[PDB]
Amino acid sequence: DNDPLVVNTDKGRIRGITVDAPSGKKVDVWLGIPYAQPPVGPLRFRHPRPAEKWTGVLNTTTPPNSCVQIVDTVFGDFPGATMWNPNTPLSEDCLYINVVAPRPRPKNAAVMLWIFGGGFYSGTATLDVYDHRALASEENVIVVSLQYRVASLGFLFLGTPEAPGNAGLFDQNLALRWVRDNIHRFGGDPSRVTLFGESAGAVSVSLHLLSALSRDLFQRAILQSGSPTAPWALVSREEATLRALRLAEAVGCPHEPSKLSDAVECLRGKDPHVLVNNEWGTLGICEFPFVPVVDGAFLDETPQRSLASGRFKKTEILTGSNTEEGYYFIIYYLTELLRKEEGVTVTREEFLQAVRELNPYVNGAARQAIVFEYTDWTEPDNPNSNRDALDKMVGDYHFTCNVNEFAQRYAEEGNNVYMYLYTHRSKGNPWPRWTGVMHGDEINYVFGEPLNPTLGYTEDEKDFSRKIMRYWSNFAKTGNPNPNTASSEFPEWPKHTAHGRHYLELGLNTSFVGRGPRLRQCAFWKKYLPQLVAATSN
Amino acid sequence: DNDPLVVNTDKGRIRGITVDAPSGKKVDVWLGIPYAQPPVGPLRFRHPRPAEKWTGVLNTTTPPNSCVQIVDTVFGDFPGATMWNPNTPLSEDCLYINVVAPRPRPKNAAVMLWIFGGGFYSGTATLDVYDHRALASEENVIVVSLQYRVASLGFLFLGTPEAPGNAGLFDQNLALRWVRDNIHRFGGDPSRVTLFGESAGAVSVSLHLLSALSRDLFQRAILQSGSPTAPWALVSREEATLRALRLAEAVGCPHEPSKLSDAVECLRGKDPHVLVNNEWGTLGICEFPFVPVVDGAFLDETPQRSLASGRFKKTEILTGSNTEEGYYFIIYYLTELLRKEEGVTVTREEFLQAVRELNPYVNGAARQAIVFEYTDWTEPDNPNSNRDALDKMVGDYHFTCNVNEFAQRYAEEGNNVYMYLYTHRSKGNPWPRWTGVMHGDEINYVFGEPLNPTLGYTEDEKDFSRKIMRYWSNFAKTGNPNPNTASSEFPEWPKHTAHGRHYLELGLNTSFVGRGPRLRQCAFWKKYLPQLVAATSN
Numbered sequence A, B: 001d002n003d004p005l006v007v008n009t010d011k012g013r014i015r016g017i018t019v020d021a022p023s024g025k026k027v028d029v030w031l032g033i034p035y036a037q038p039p040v041g042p043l044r045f046r047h048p049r050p051a052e053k054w055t056g057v058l059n060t061t062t063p064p065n066s067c068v069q070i071v072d073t074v075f076g077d078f079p080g081a082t083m084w085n086p087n088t089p090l091s092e093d094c095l096y097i098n099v100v101a102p103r104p105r106p107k108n109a110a111v112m113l114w115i116f117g118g119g120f121y122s123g124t125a126t127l128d129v130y131d132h133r134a135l136a137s138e139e140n141v142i143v144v145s146l147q148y149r150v151a152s153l154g155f156l157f158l159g160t161p162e163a164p165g166n167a168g169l170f171d172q173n174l175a176l177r178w179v180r181d182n183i184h185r186f187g188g189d190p191s192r193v194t195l196f197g198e199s200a201g202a203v204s205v206s207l208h209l210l211s212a213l214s215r216d217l218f219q220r221a222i223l224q225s226g227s228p229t230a231p232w233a234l235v236s237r238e239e240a241t242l243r244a245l246r247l248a249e250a251v252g253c254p255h256e257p258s259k260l261s262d263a264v265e266c267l268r269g270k271d272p273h274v275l276v277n278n279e280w281g282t283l284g285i286c287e288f289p290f291v292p293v294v295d296g297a298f299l300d301e302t303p304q305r306s307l308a309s310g311r312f313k314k315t316e317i318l319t320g321s322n323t324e325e326g327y328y329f330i331i332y333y334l335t336e337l338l339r340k341e342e343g344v345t346v347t348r349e350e351f352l353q354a355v356r357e358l359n360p361y362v363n364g365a366a367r368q369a370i371v372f373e374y375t376d377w378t379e380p381d382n383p384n385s386n387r388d389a390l391d392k393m394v395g396d397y398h399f400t401c402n403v404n405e406f407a408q409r410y411a412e413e414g415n416n417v418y419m420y421l422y423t424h425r426s427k428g429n430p431w432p433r434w435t436g437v438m439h440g441d442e443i444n445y446v447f448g449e450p451l452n453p454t455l456g457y458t459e460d461e462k463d464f465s466r467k468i469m470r471y472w473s474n475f476a477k478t479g480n481p482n483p484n485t486a487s488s489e490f491p492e493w494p495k496h497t498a499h500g501r502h503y504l505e506l507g508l509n510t511s512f513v514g515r516g517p518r519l520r521q522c523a524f525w526k527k528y529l530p531q532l533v534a535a536t537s538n
């Protein structure tokens, strides 16, 4: 056939459609290419199974279903909240891929594969924030996004072959194999596959760097605000089984560590929505109920021991954090203090109580070490300082420091690393101005949302998006974000070396290069506090 | 008399002499005016008895004896060591005063009274670095210095009335009463008497702001690198007794707690040089064998309880610290590592051993807090960082942070405080380069030594001398170091507020104003570390 919009995948034929990007430029899109058998009925919790081949031609012109998940109604129809809520119908049948190619269709181009992050409980590839149209048309790259099972439906673990765990990761893995097989027909290059994700999506990307089954399915990796060594990224096999039995109990099912086949069978019987809506029990800040676990097949050792032994892919890494990683999660947790309102502050007394609520597992001597490390000593009682203190102690421990650790290990094992610190507030930020540059703020800019003129981004912000969009893309191409010509509009990004530890600051009016970021506090969490908790355990 | 150089004191008549400052400017000087009975034999260790009235006229024209003390023979004839060594004959007969008045002799000008510091074991007002002429001639102020008993001869304590302790402080006090009684005859204003000292001398100055006795004798105070809250500035009456009995044993006499009167008797019969040369034994860094003690008369409470309540003179204060306070004391103690030579460095392993030796009293969980607080987490194993970390951990604990505490307690008691940070290296510094700005470097500049045409100070340093001489002088005049006209060559020195905590950096090409200085580390010692030691103790 001579129609370019149709493509012959290894399992059948699909038809795409030509759509114009908000930039005016046009791209070809294929939306909702099935990569697996719908994981319904007896297949729930279990690993994905390759899609059955189909007769005739399939219309891949519609954004696919998103996986069954919780919806965020906490702040109602607040744009800053609803933008992360699913914009397609919720279904168990959600395992699909989206492919976007620039026009004219490139001969053989690098492919950027987006694994979304939703803390392993939420998310969809169809979110308007992740728009491939802009990234593809502007950087001349194949942009690909996959859907993966999320929450317990994707991460329930019991130890039995009935609930093996990491089902969502296997969903991603199968989708990666699909890309190697089929991406060339779109103008892709199965050799040059760059994985990029944010938060839990970046955690995923990192696990694919570690995984045996995922090793030779991609080339490079970009990791936004995520790391496999993060406290929330994994959960012990023992806890994961208890979390599952708690879900069984809360939903009405039998809960007995003796007979687990009864639990899974009953759980496969209950409603998907009824299932996901009961996962949330007594959890502290930044801990999610159903996440990856060391299963033996996808991962046979904790990311700690994989990093320590150097057992991870040898390839280039682009990673980094935002300035206020903590605030987002403190806003949803800990809700009476830090309300969604302008000019929020924290009294010294309130701050003292907060470090107890935000680190519920430490002994007090460790708490006092936390209060000392995170208080501003020029002005200890300052209400602004004490609020920002809460952001940093959450943001460092759960995000910034883990990204640093992963970036360092990769560097000292001989790999080229490119670290960033994202310091940019959008003018049109819907959140209170004390929140600053929060978790996931960079996403709008990497996907080239400022280029959409219907959203009144400033002209400087439009240049800024194009700037980091370039860094990202030509890292995916060359393994180095810096252009070949070394331009003025694209400042130099030094390699994050094992000794130097340099990062580029990504902001409007800067080319600043620091060392870190936040090396002292990251040493506090990784070095000092562990040995203090070890000494004061009795 | 019609001879201006002759002065009628309340105990007799004295003849001075007119000489030139090194600058050329001429001043009248009175050297070795006796303010007390020579504390010899029976009067040893005891308080000073006032001067006995003398017949005729006494030629106070020769620099007085220095009190009996040890001489620094550690580095030989090295100028950096010998400048602090006594330059007049050593005698127990040493209780004298020096008065220097400018010409033309002014009608009630300000009075700047210098109390030297030598860790209460050494020092003399006769040192070439304490030359008054330049200060009097260049600032039009009456400059007064006093000799006080140092070491055991001035600070031996046994609880007995024959060894009541603080003898050296009562020496200082009696001399202050002399100045109040007589300074008008020399052309000074008795109400405008300003005390200023360095190290132990500054500690002394602070103890006069606290003391019941010295309370009303002076107006203002200047405190250079010293405060009464410093760890080395006092001892438990209980220790002091043991130190005394340890000396009594070492010198070869009865060391019996049963009767102390038998010990004091012998000590009064022993050679003074023999006494001062046997005081040193088992002592860590920055702790001196015979220092002030809470006696009931001069001080009835620890400077801690005194500062806590608010019982201290309500006056202006000009205080501060140098950048590298610790080095000097680490050069002498801990002498195998950190030799007196260029480009010395400390390995991480050596640094780990040093923190053990320099803080010999802490438990080990505290040492882990110290190694963490004093390490460059940018580059932890840096040999330069590990050497400078040694300076800072000594300099903060024994000096900078105690100055900070004192100044802050005065600020929040509603007094005008002016904090400095001296950051200047003289071009002709005899010590190695790595030492930087050490303890007592400011002295040369406050006393106007650069103005001496025979010495190799640069023209900028000569300006910098006059600048800090001005700040010092018109503080002693007005109560504020800033010029009334608010000039541009003499930058503004903001007030050290209990809230702002601003300090002025005293350096060559800087007018910079910071906060603290070094509040983060000062809070480590004053807030965090004691509560850690409390938690980890059993």
Ligand SMILES: *[C@@H]1O[C@H](CO)[C@@H](O[C@@H]2O[C@H](CO)[C@@H](O[C@@H]3O[C@H](CO[C@H]4O[C@H](CO)[C@@H](O)[C@H](O)[C@@H]4O)[C@@H](O)[C@H](O[C@H]4O[C@H](CO)[C@@H](O)[C@H](O)[C@@H]4O)[C@@H]3O)[C@H](O)[C@H]2NC(C)=O)[C@H](O)[C@H]1NC(C)=O
Binding pocket: B015, B059
């Ligand atoms: C600090 O304190 C000292 C004493 O502790 C004060 O006394 C000064 O001392 C000297 C010497 O004693 C005075 O100078 C002269 O005194 C002489 C006394 O005569 C004896 O000594 C000299 C030898 O040194 C010989 O003449 C003789 O052998 C005596 O044994 C006199 O010589 C002088 O007086 C003369 O005056 C006229 C001129 O007017 C001459 O023509 C005569 O020769 C006559 O004898 C002279 O006075 C000195 O003057 C004393 N000072 C004062 C102010 O009187 C010092 O006062 C004090 N220091 C200072 C700098 O003032």
Ligand SMILES: *[C@@H]1O[C@H](CO)[C@@H](O[C@@H]2O[C@H](CO)[C@@H](O[C@@H]3O[C@H](CO)[C@@H](O)[C@H](O[C@H]4O[C@H](CO)[C@@H](O)[C@H](O)[C@@H]4O)[C@@H]3O)[C@H](O)[C@H]2NC(C)=O)[C@H](O)[C@H]1NC(C)=O
Binding pocket: A015, A059
């Ligand atoms: C996707 O799936 C759909 C359904 O599963 C299917 O659509 C088909 O596409 C063809 C070709 O594009 C269409 O052809 C039409 O055939 C009818 C015959 O009755 C004609 O009447 C149509 O002509 C219309 O053209 C104008 C439309 O603007 C109008 O003026 C007026 O309605 C005319 O009648 C037209 O030629 C048809 O819609 C279907 N047919 C079949 C048999 O499925 C196709 O598989 C996929 N479509 C695409 C384009 O991806």
Ligand SMILES: *[C@@H]1O[C@H](CO)[C@@H](O)[C@H](O)[C@H]1NC(C)=O
Binding pocket: A509
């Ligand atoms: C920062 O950017 C602004 C433009 O908004 C401009 O003042 C200048 O380029 C930068 N600041 C400096 C260098 O003063």
Ligand SMILES: *[C@@H]1O[C@H](CO)[C@@H](O)[C@H](O)[C@H]1NC(C)=O
Binding pocket: B509
């Ligand atoms: C002071 O230092 C600055 C460095 O920024 C420079 O202007 C110069 O070296 C110095 N200024 C003067 C007045 O010499």
Ligand SMILES: [Co+2]
Binding pocket: A249, A255
């Ligand atoms: Co039950």
Ligand SMILES: [Co+2]
Binding pocket: B255
């Ligand atoms: Co004995």
